mmCIF file of N, CA and C in Angstrom:
data_model
loop_
_atom_site.group_PDB
_atom_site.id
_atom_site.type_symbol
_atom_site.label_atom_id
_atom_site.label_comp_id
_atom_site.label_asym_id
_atom_site.label_seq_id
_atom_site.Cartn_x
_atom_site.Cartn_y
_atom_site.Cartn_z
ATOM 1 N N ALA A 81 9.232 -20.879 18.992
ATOM 2 C CA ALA A 81 7.997 -20.064 18.993
ATOM 3 C C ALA A 81 7.149 -21.032 18.892
ATOM 4 N N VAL A 82 7.741 -22.062 17.521
ATOM 5 C CA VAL A 82 6.616 -23.231 16.874
ATOM 6 C C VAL A 82 7.189 -24.019 17.607
ATOM 7 N N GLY A 83 8.056 -24.773 18.467
ATOM 8 C CA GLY A 83 8.090 -25.854 19.532
ATOM 9 C C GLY A 83 6.841 -25.309 20.813
ATOM 10 N N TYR A 84 7.283 -24.157 21.008
ATOM 11 C CA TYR A 84 6.466 -24.004 22.279
ATOM 12 C C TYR A 84 4.604 -23.886 21.591
ATOM 13 N N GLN A 85 3.882 -23.561 20.837
ATOM 14 C CA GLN A 85 2.940 -23.673 19.992
ATOM 15 C C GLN A 85 2.468 -25.442 20.075
ATOM 16 N N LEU A 86 3.672 -26.181 19.146
ATOM 17 C CA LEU A 86 3.393 -27.135 18.975
ATOM 18 C C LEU A 86 3.014 -27.638 20.048
ATOM 19 N N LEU A 87 3.571 -27.423 21.410
ATOM 20 C CA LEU A 87 3.902 -28.111 22.298
ATOM 21 C C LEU A 87 2.035 -27.731 23.550
ATOM 22 N N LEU A 88 1.584 -26.524 23.171
ATOM 23 C CA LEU A 88 0.468 -26.264 23.712
ATOM 24 C C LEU A 88 -0.742 -26.723 23.013
ATOM 25 N N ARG A 89 -0.275 -27.155 21.890
ATOM 26 C CA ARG A 89 -1.476 -27.820 21.303
ATOM 27 C C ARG A 89 -1.782 -29.166 21.635
ATOM 28 N N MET A 90 -0.444 -30.115 21.326
ATOM 29 C CA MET A 90 -0.501 -32.154 22.012
ATOM 30 C C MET A 90 -0.379 -31.545 23.507
ATOM 31 N N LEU A 91 -0.198 -31.034 24.184
ATOM 32 C CA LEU A 91 -0.316 -31.370 26.094
ATOM 33 C C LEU A 91 -1.284 -32.033 26.273
ATOM 34 N N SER A 92 -2.418 -31.800 25.465
ATOM 35 C CA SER A 92 -3.779 -32.354 25.710
ATOM 36 C C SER A 92 -4.026 -34.177 25.382
ATOM 37 N N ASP A 93 -3.094 -34.205 24.723
ATOM 38 C CA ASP A 93 -2.664 -35.697 24.381
ATOM 39 C C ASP A 93 -2.606 -36.551 25.050
ATOM 40 N N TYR A 94 -1.860 -36.431 26.192
ATOM 41 C CA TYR A 94 -1.238 -36.766 27.162
ATOM 42 C C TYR A 94 -1.711 -36.308 28.323
ATOM 43 N N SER A 95 -3.277 -36.305 28.527
ATOM 44 C CA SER A 95 -3.968 -35.421 29.989
ATOM 45 C C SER A 95 -2.746 -34.534 30.983
ATOM 46 N N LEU A 96 -2.308 -33.062 30.002
ATOM 47 C CA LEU A 96 -1.205 -32.556 30.926
ATOM 48 C C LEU A 96 -2.024 -31.309 30.895
ATOM 49 N N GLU A 97 -1.737 -30.605 32.325
ATOM 50 C CA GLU A 97 -1.613 -29.032 31.958
ATOM 51 C C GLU A 97 -0.654 -28.392 31.928
ATOM 52 N N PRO A 98 -0.459 -26.832 31.257
ATOM 53 C CA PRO A 98 -0.178 -25.908 31.402
ATOM 54 C C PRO A 98 0.269 -24.971 32.362
ATOM 55 N N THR A 99 1.494 -24.854 32.633
ATOM 56 C CA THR A 99 2.364 -23.716 33.852
ATOM 57 C C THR A 99 1.810 -22.852 33.590
ATOM 58 N N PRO A 100 1.838 -22.122 34.447
ATOM 59 C CA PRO A 100 2.109 -20.099 33.819
ATOM 60 C C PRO A 100 3.385 -19.762 33.106
ATOM 61 N N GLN A 101 4.343 -20.306 33.911
ATOM 62 C CA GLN A 101 5.501 -20.178 33.599
ATOM 63 C C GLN A 101 5.728 -20.554 31.670
ATOM 64 N N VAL A 102 5.187 -21.999 31.258
ATOM 65 C CA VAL A 102 5.354 -21.960 30.421
ATOM 66 C C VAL A 102 4.488 -21.138 29.454
ATOM 67 N N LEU A 103 3.585 -20.974 29.704
ATOM 68 C CA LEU A 103 2.262 -19.840 28.661
ATOM 69 C C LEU A 103 2.713 -18.547 28.950
ATOM 70 N N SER A 104 3.524 -18.198 29.470
ATOM 71 C CA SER A 104 4.459 -16.595 29.719
ATOM 72 C C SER A 104 5.652 -17.014 28.534
ATOM 73 N N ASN A 105 5.876 -18.267 28.614
ATOM 74 C CA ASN A 105 7.358 -18.299 28.143
ATOM 75 C C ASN A 105 6.782 -18.210 26.132
ATOM 76 N N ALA A 106 5.798 -18.888 26.085
ATOM 77 C CA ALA A 106 5.606 -19.185 24.719
ATOM 78 C C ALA A 106 5.039 -18.222 24.295
ATOM 79 N N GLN A 107 3.920 -17.184 25.250
ATOM 80 C CA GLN A 107 3.672 -15.975 24.871
ATOM 81 C C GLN A 107 4.898 -15.007 24.387
ATOM 82 N N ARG A 108 5.573 -15.079 24.978
ATOM 83 C CA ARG A 108 7.264 -14.215 24.473
ATOM 84 C C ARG A 108 7.524 -14.683 23.148
ATOM 85 N N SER A 109 7.877 -15.526 23.153
ATOM 86 C CA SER A 109 7.839 -16.184 21.694
ATOM 87 C C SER A 109 7.075 -16.251 20.677
ATOM 88 N N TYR A 110 6.043 -16.247 21.309
ATOM 89 C CA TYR A 110 4.488 -15.539 19.690
ATOM 90 C C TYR A 110 4.858 -14.343 19.259
ATOM 91 N N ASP A 111 5.083 -13.100 20.531
ATOM 92 C CA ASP A 111 5.429 -12.160 20.317
ATOM 93 C C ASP A 111 6.625 -11.949 19.061
ATOM 94 N N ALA A 112 7.759 -12.568 19.562
ATOM 95 C CA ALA A 112 8.964 -12.097 18.817
ATOM 96 C C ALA A 112 8.994 -13.357 17.811
ATOM 97 N N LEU A 113 7.525 -14.236 17.199
ATOM 98 C CA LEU A 113 7.588 -14.335 16.246
ATOM 99 C C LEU A 113 6.591 -13.164 15.372
ATOM 100 N N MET A 114 5.922 -12.724 15.735
ATOM 101 C CA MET A 114 4.860 -11.801 15.317
ATOM 102 C C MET A 114 5.658 -10.556 14.841
ATOM 103 N N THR A 115 6.772 -9.930 15.607
ATOM 104 C CA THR A 115 7.494 -9.110 15.812
ATOM 105 C C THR A 115 8.202 -9.320 14.406
ATOM 106 N N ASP A 116 8.667 -10.270 13.583
ATOM 107 C CA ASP A 116 9.480 -10.366 12.401
ATOM 108 C C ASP A 116 8.432 -9.999 11.324
ATOM 109 N N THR A 117 7.324 -9.977 10.912
ATOM 110 C CA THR A 117 6.422 -10.366 10.350
ATOM 111 C C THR A 117 5.650 -8.979 10.164
ATOM 112 N N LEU A 118 5.621 -7.961 10.394
ATOM 113 C CA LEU A 118 5.003 -6.376 10.031
ATOM 114 C C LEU A 118 5.129 -6.339 8.859
ATOM 115 N N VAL A 119 3.635 -5.257 8.912
ATOM 116 C CA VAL A 119 3.520 -5.539 7.231
ATOM 117 C C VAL A 119 3.187 -3.415 7.061
ATOM 118 N N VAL A 120 2.169 -2.979 8.110
ATOM 119 C CA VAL A 120 1.787 -1.424 7.716
ATOM 120 C C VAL A 120 2.080 -1.486 6.658
ATOM 121 N N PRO A 121 0.411 -1.046 5.954
ATOM 122 C CA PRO A 121 0.220 -1.001 4.670
ATOM 123 C C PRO A 121 0.598 -0.355 4.492
ATOM 124 N N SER A 122 0.697 1.159 4.467
ATOM 125 C CA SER A 122 1.136 2.702 4.657
ATOM 126 C C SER A 122 -0.242 3.048 3.227
ATOM 127 N N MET A 123 -1.438 3.418 3.832
ATOM 128 C CA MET A 123 -2.511 3.578 2.890
ATOM 129 C C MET A 123 -2.296 4.289 1.810
ATOM 130 N N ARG A 124 -2.771 4.693 0.657
ATOM 131 C CA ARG A 124 -2.728 5.405 -0.400
ATOM 132 C C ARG A 124 -3.129 7.065 -0.724
ATOM 133 N N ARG A 125 -3.199 7.523 -1.627
ATOM 134 C CA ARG A 125 -3.834 8.308 -1.786
ATOM 135 C C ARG A 125 -5.534 8.215 -2.185
ATOM 136 N N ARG A 126 -6.383 8.769 -2.512
ATOM 137 C CA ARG A 126 -7.930 9.318 -2.721
ATOM 138 C C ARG A 126 -7.938 8.269 -4.480
ATOM 139 N N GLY A 127 -7.666 8.780 -5.087
ATOM 140 C CA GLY A 127 -7.885 8.864 -6.603
ATOM 141 C C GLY A 127 -8.126 10.286 -7.354
ATOM 142 N N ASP A 128 -9.100 10.899 -6.964
ATOM 143 C CA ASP A 128 -9.498 12.214 -7.366
ATOM 144 C C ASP A 128 -8.952 13.544 -6.381
ATOM 145 N N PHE A 129 -8.074 13.156 -5.931
ATOM 146 C CA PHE A 129 -7.601 14.286 -5.131
ATOM 147 C C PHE A 129 -6.105 15.481 -6.254
ATOM 148 N N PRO A 130 -6.576 16.055 -6.025
ATOM 149 C CA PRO A 130 -6.304 17.565 -7.345
ATOM 150 C C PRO A 130 -4.463 17.159 -6.556
ATOM 151 N N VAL A 131 -4.004 17.507 -7.612
ATOM 152 C CA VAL A 131 -2.056 17.958 -7.592
ATOM 153 C C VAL A 131 -1.784 19.331 -8.010
ATOM 154 N N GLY A 132 -1.233 19.790 -6.607
ATOM 155 C CA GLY A 132 -1.217 21.165 -7.046
ATOM 156 C C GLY A 132 -0.506 21.602 -8.230
ATOM 157 N N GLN A 133 -0.104 23.064 -7.950
ATOM 158 C CA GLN A 133 -0.082 23.774 -9.702
ATOM 159 C C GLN A 133 1.574 23.809 -8.945
ATOM 160 N N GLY A 134 2.356 23.604 -8.192
ATOM 161 C CA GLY A 134 3.469 23.085 -7.483
ATOM 162 C C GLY A 134 4.335 22.297 -7.956
ATOM 163 N N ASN A 135 3.603 21.177 -8.123
ATOM 164 C CA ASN A 135 4.155 20.384 -8.636
ATOM 165 C C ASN A 135 4.766 20.363 -10.176
ATOM 166 N N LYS A 136 3.810 21.583 -10.574
ATOM 167 C CA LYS A 136 4.625 21.574 -12.191
ATOM 168 C C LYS A 136 3.384 20.774 -13.543
ATOM 169 N N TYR A 137 2.511 20.224 -13.408
ATOM 170 C CA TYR A 137 1.945 19.266 -14.325
ATOM 171 C C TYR A 137 1.556 19.444 -15.516
ATOM 172 N N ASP A 138 1.929 20.814 -16.696
ATOM 173 C CA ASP A 138 2.573 21.196 -17.518
ATOM 174 C C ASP A 138 3.571 20.445 -18.143
ATOM 175 N N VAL A 139 4.596 21.187 -17.482
ATOM 176 C CA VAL A 139 5.476 20.419 -18.071
ATOM 177 C C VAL A 139 6.205 19.206 -17.321
ATOM 178 N N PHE A 140 6.162 19.264 -15.825
ATOM 179 C CA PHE A 140 6.854 18.321 -15.423
ATOM 180 C C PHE A 140 6.102 16.401 -15.637
ATOM 181 N N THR A 141 5.433 16.767 -15.272
ATOM 182 C CA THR A 141 4.597 15.504 -15.086
ATOM 183 C C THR A 141 3.340 15.748 -15.865
ATOM 184 N N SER A 142 2.542 14.817 -16.963
ATOM 185 C CA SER A 142 1.134 14.838 -17.271
ATOM 186 C C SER A 142 -0.114 15.109 -16.806
ATOM 187 N N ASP A 143 -0.030 14.036 -16.392
ATOM 188 C CA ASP A 143 -1.124 13.868 -15.378
ATOM 189 C C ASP A 143 -1.801 15.614 -14.469
ATOM 190 N N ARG A 144 -2.391 15.584 -14.238
ATOM 191 C CA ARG A 144 -2.617 16.801 -12.882
ATOM 192 C C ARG A 144 -3.637 15.849 -11.896
ATOM 193 N N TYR A 145 -3.761 14.816 -11.692
ATOM 194 C CA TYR A 145 -4.677 14.300 -10.829
ATOM 195 C C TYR A 145 -4.050 13.370 -10.256
ATOM 196 N N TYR A 146 -3.877 12.186 -9.075
ATOM 197 C CA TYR A 146 -3.445 11.558 -8.391
ATOM 198 C C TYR A 146 -3.584 9.989 -8.949
ATOM 199 N N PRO A 147 -2.783 8.900 -9.541
ATOM 200 C CA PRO A 147 -3.414 8.025 -10.478
ATOM 201 C C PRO A 147 -4.118 7.804 -9.615
ATOM 202 N N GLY A 148 -3.496 6.638 -8.537
ATOM 203 C CA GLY A 148 -4.549 5.148 -7.888
ATOM 204 C C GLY A 148 -4.243 4.540 -8.404
ATOM 205 N N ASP A 149 -2.779 4.077 -8.582
ATOM 206 C CA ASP A 149 -2.215 2.648 -9.292
ATOM 207 C C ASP A 149 -1.343 2.640 -9.747
ATOM 208 N N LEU A 150 -0.565 1.685 -9.951
ATOM 209 C CA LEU A 150 0.960 1.343 -10.249
ATOM 210 C C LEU A 150 1.180 2.149 -12.000
ATOM 211 N N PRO A 151 1.727 2.653 -11.572
ATOM 212 C CA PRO A 151 1.640 2.629 -13.353
ATOM 213 C C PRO A 151 3.394 2.295 -14.109
ATOM 214 N N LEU A 152 3.123 1.789 -14.610
ATOM 215 C CA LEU A 152 3.906 1.022 -15.501
ATOM 216 C C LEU A 152 4.743 1.587 -16.893
ATOM 217 N N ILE A 153 5.287 0.469 -17.695
ATOM 218 C CA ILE A 153 5.558 1.434 -19.327
ATOM 219 C C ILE A 153 4.446 0.587 -20.607
ATOM 220 N N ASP A 154 4.563 -0.950 -20.443
ATOM 221 C CA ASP A 154 3.371 -1.268 -21.839
ATOM 222 C C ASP A 154 2.738 -2.028 -21.280
ATOM 223 N N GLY A 155 2.790 -2.738 -19.974
ATOM 224 C CA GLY A 155 1.186 -3.530 -19.107
ATOM 225 C C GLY A 155 0.303 -2.813 -19.231
ATOM 226 N N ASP A 156 -0.024 -1.703 -19.096
ATOM 227 C CA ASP A 156 -1.065 -0.511 -18.838
ATOM 228 C C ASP A 156 -2.467 -0.898 -18.613
ATOM 229 N N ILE A 157 -2.055 -1.576 -17.515
ATOM 230 C CA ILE A 157 -3.123 -2.272 -16.898
ATOM 231 C C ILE A 157 -3.858 -3.552 -17.895
ATOM 232 N N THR B 52 7.915 10.637 -0.822
ATOM 233 C CA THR B 52 8.453 9.588 -0.536
ATOM 234 C C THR B 52 7.967 8.092 -0.792
ATOM 235 N N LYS B 53 8.597 6.833 -0.471
ATOM 236 C CA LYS B 53 8.693 5.876 -1.265
ATOM 237 C C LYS B 53 7.039 5.145 -1.167
ATOM 238 N N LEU B 54 6.499 5.134 0.400
ATOM 239 C CA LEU B 54 4.405 5.369 0.281
ATOM 240 C C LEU B 54 3.967 3.661 -0.047
ATOM 241 N N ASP B 55 5.227 2.496 0.730
ATOM 242 C CA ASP B 55 4.561 1.086 -0.586
ATOM 243 C C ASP B 55 5.346 0.927 -2.158
ATOM 244 N N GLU B 56 6.596 1.377 -1.886
ATOM 245 C CA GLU B 56 7.445 1.173 -3.005
ATOM 246 C C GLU B 56 6.856 1.879 -4.783
ATOM 247 N N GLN B 57 6.455 3.344 -4.157
ATOM 248 C CA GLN B 57 6.235 4.048 -4.624
ATOM 249 C C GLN B 57 7.045 5.134 -4.806
ATOM 250 N N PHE B 58 6.432 6.790 -6.013
ATOM 251 C CA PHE B 58 7.115 7.890 -5.226
ATOM 252 C C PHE B 58 5.850 9.242 -5.756
ATOM 253 N N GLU B 59 4.847 8.527 -5.048
ATOM 254 C CA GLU B 59 3.974 9.312 -5.177
ATOM 255 C C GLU B 59 4.625 10.590 -4.302
ATOM 256 N N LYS B 60 4.410 11.997 -4.620
ATOM 257 C CA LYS B 60 4.219 13.249 -4.577
ATOM 258 C C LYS B 60 4.116 13.539 -3.158
ATOM 259 N N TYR B 61 4.612 15.279 -2.775
ATOM 260 C CA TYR B 61 3.471 15.723 -1.718
ATOM 261 C C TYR B 61 2.512 16.557 -2.873
ATOM 262 N N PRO B 62 1.579 16.810 -1.959
ATOM 263 C CA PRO B 62 0.172 17.721 -2.697
ATOM 264 C C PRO B 62 1.021 19.706 -2.298
ATOM 265 N N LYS B 63 1.329 20.019 -3.505
ATOM 266 C CA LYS B 63 1.808 21.560 -3.442
ATOM 267 C C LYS B 63 0.871 22.307 -3.709
ATOM 268 N N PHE B 64 -0.394 22.743 -3.148
ATOM 269 C CA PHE B 64 -1.281 24.198 -3.546
ATOM 270 C C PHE B 64 -0.679 25.158 -3.570
ATOM 271 N N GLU B 65 -1.210 26.417 -4.369
ATOM 272 C CA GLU B 65 -0.412 27.537 -4.950
ATOM 273 C C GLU B 65 -1.201 28.656 -4.959
ATOM 274 N N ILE B 66 -1.501 29.692 -3.485
ATOM 275 C CA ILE B 66 -2.866 30.393 -3.908
ATOM 276 C C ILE B 66 -2.219 31.850 -3.626
ATOM 277 N N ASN B 67 -1.980 32.487 -4.827
ATOM 278 C CA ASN B 67 -0.474 33.179 -4.787
ATOM 279 C C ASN B 67 -1.528 34.787 -4.582
ATOM 280 N N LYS B 68 -1.650 35.634 -3.813
ATOM 281 C CA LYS B 68 -2.065 36.731 -2.442
ATOM 282 C C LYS B 68 -0.515 37.704 -2.963
ATOM 283 N N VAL B 69 0.572 37.567 -3.193
ATOM 284 C CA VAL B 69 1.254 39.195 -3.373
ATOM 285 C C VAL B 69 1.321 39.834 -3.841
ATOM 286 N N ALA B 70 0.911 39.806 -5.353
ATOM 287 C CA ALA B 70 0.179 40.391 -6.209
ATOM 288 C C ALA B 70 -0.570 41.748 -6.238
ATOM 289 N N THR B 71 -1.450 41.477 -5.427
ATOM 290 C CA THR B 71 -2.659 42.257 -5.530
ATOM 291 C C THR B 71 -1.881 43.840 -5.650
ATOM 292 N N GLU B 72 -0.489 43.956 -4.521
ATOM 293 C CA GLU B 72 -0.381 45.703 -4.309
ATOM 294 C C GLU B 72 0.778 45.311 -5.209
ATOM 295 N N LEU B 73 1.648 44.739 -5.730
ATOM 296 C CA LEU B 73 2.016 45.201 -6.798
ATOM 297 C C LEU B 73 1.762 45.531 -7.739
ATOM 298 N N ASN B 74 0.445 44.835 -8.712
ATOM 299 C CA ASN B 74 -0.176 45.002 -9.230
ATOM 300 C C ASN B 74 -1.029 46.502 -8.960
ATOM 301 N N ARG B 75 -1.549 46.931 -7.818
ATOM 302 C CA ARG B 75 -2.228 47.869 -7.698
ATOM 303 C C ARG B 75 -0.777 49.084 -8.263
ATOM 304 N N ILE B 76 0.187 48.994 -7.464
ATOM 305 C CA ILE B 76 1.181 50.211 -7.756
ATOM 306 C C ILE B 76 1.332 50.357 -8.815
ATOM 307 N N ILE B 77 1.319 48.647 -10.081
ATOM 308 C CA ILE B 77 1.483 49.041 -11.313
ATOM 309 C C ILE B 77 0.476 49.935 -12.127
ATOM 310 N N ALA B 78 -0.854 49.893 -11.629
ATOM 311 C CA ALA B 78 -2.113 50.238 -12.494
ATOM 312 C C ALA B 78 -1.718 52.111 -11.887
ATOM 313 N N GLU B 79 -0.883 52.680 -10.536
ATOM 314 C CA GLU B 79 -0.761 53.390 -10.084
ATOM 315 C C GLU B 79 -0.319 54.844 -10.863
ATOM 316 N N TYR B 80 0.577 53.841 -11.148
ATOM 317 C CA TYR B 80 2.175 54.428 -12.432
ATOM 318 C C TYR B 80 1.108 54.323 -13.683
ATOM 319 N N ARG B 81 0.643 53.426 -14.596
ATOM 320 C CA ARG B 81 0.453 53.602 -15.362
ATOM 321 C C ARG B 81 -0.781 54.765 -15.381
ATOM 322 N N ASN B 82 -1.477 55.126 -14.797
ATOM 323 C CA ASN B 82 -3.057 55.513 -14.657
ATOM 324 C C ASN B 82 -2.056 57.342 -14.473
ATOM 325 N N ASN B 83 -1.036 57.852 -14.125
ATOM 326 C CA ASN B 83 -0.147 58.715 -14.445
ATOM 327 C C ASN B 83 1.025 58.644 -14.819
ATOM 328 N N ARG B 84 1.305 58.794 -16.142
ATOM 329 C CA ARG B 84 2.706 58.324 -17.039
ATOM 330 C C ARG B 84 3.719 60.289 -16.299
ATOM 331 N N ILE B 85 4.674 59.704 -16.088
ATOM 332 C CA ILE B 85 5.388 60.768 -16.771
ATOM 333 C C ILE B 85 6.802 60.898 -17.267
ATOM 334 N N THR B 86 7.192 62.162 -18.097
ATOM 335 C CA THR B 86 7.973 62.402 -18.710
ATOM 336 C C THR B 86 9.117 63.456 -18.809
ATOM 337 N N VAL B 87 9.651 63.569 -19.539
ATOM 338 C CA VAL B 87 11.238 64.779 -19.761
ATOM 339 C C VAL B 87 10.023 66.192 -19.687
ATOM 340 N N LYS B 88 10.463 66.815 -19.240
ATOM 341 C CA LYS B 88 10.768 68.541 -19.320
ATOM 342 C C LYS B 88 11.664 69.744 -19.263
ATOM 343 N N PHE B 89 11.539 70.296 -20.139
ATOM 344 C CA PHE B 89 12.547 71.743 -20.123
ATOM 345 C C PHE B 89 11.898 72.998 -19.981
ATOM 346 N N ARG B 90 12.462 73.477 -18.759
ATOM 347 C CA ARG B 90 11.902 74.607 -18.229
ATOM 348 C C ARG B 90 12.747 76.146 -18.732
ATOM 349 N N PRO B 91 12.440 76.797 -19.177
ATOM 350 C CA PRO B 91 13.177 77.958 -19.876
ATOM 351 C C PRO B 91 13.932 78.640 -18.348
ATOM 352 N N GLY B 92 14.924 79.446 -18.920
ATOM 353 C CA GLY B 92 15.485 80.224 -18.016
ATOM 354 C C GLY B 92 15.399 81.425 -18.292
ATOM 355 N N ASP B 93 15.995 82.814 -17.634
ATOM 356 C CA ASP B 93 15.707 84.033 -17.760
ATOM 357 C C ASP B 93 17.260 84.480 -18.722
ATOM 358 N N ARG B 94 16.202 84.108 -19.257
ATOM 359 C CA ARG B 94 17.307 85.292 -21.238
ATOM 360 C C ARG B 94 15.462 85.955 -22.382
ATOM 361 N N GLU B 95 16.602 86.112 -22.781
ATOM 362 C CA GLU B 95 15.067 86.502 -23.793
ATOM 363 C C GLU B 95 14.379 85.898 -24.970
ATOM 364 N N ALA B 96 15.548 84.671 -25.191
ATOM 365 C CA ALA B 96 14.662 83.354 -26.261
ATOM 366 C C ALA B 96 15.036 82.317 -25.797
ATOM 367 N N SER B 97 14.890 82.358 -24.314
ATOM 368 C CA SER B 97 15.316 80.354 -23.487
ATOM 369 C C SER B 97 13.507 80.295 -23.673
ATOM 370 N N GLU B 98 12.197 80.772 -24.032
ATOM 371 C CA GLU B 98 10.955 80.036 -24.410
ATOM 372 C C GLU B 98 11.392 79.438 -25.497
ATOM 373 N N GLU B 99 11.281 80.055 -26.293
ATOM 374 C CA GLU B 99 11.694 79.428 -27.312
ATOM 375 C C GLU B 99 12.400 78.490 -28.253
ATOM 376 N N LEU B 100 13.658 78.576 -27.266
ATOM 377 C CA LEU B 100 14.440 76.759 -26.935
ATOM 378 C C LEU B 100 14.258 76.114 -26.734
ATOM 379 N N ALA B 101 13.500 76.158 -24.836
ATOM 380 C CA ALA B 101 12.794 75.428 -24.328
ATOM 381 C C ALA B 101 11.605 73.922 -25.303
ATOM 382 N N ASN B 102 10.646 75.278 -25.840
ATOM 383 C CA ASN B 102 9.587 74.572 -26.413
ATOM 384 C C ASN B 102 10.340 73.924 -27.751
#
């Protein structure tokens, strides 16, 4: 993918044009590279969303609402 | 689930709707309580014994 993109960039230096097959190969390689670096951020909750009584917020977990941030032990924001 | 390297839990809301009839039955009993009663027989002194 890197080689094909670099060739596409430097083709104009020597006054050439890219044939459609080269473009298709470069597109396929770029798609293959972009596949390997997906993110999918997977959005979190709101922050004031209630936590139901089914989670036993009285004894199991002290908080009764969704945090909205990473809990820690000593950094404590 | 992990949910981007955490352990956020599913919301679990509870709306109790099955205790209404149970409370109604309990109130029905507590409004009219029952106990043990002794009935007399066909003798000369069964009434005093039952009392």
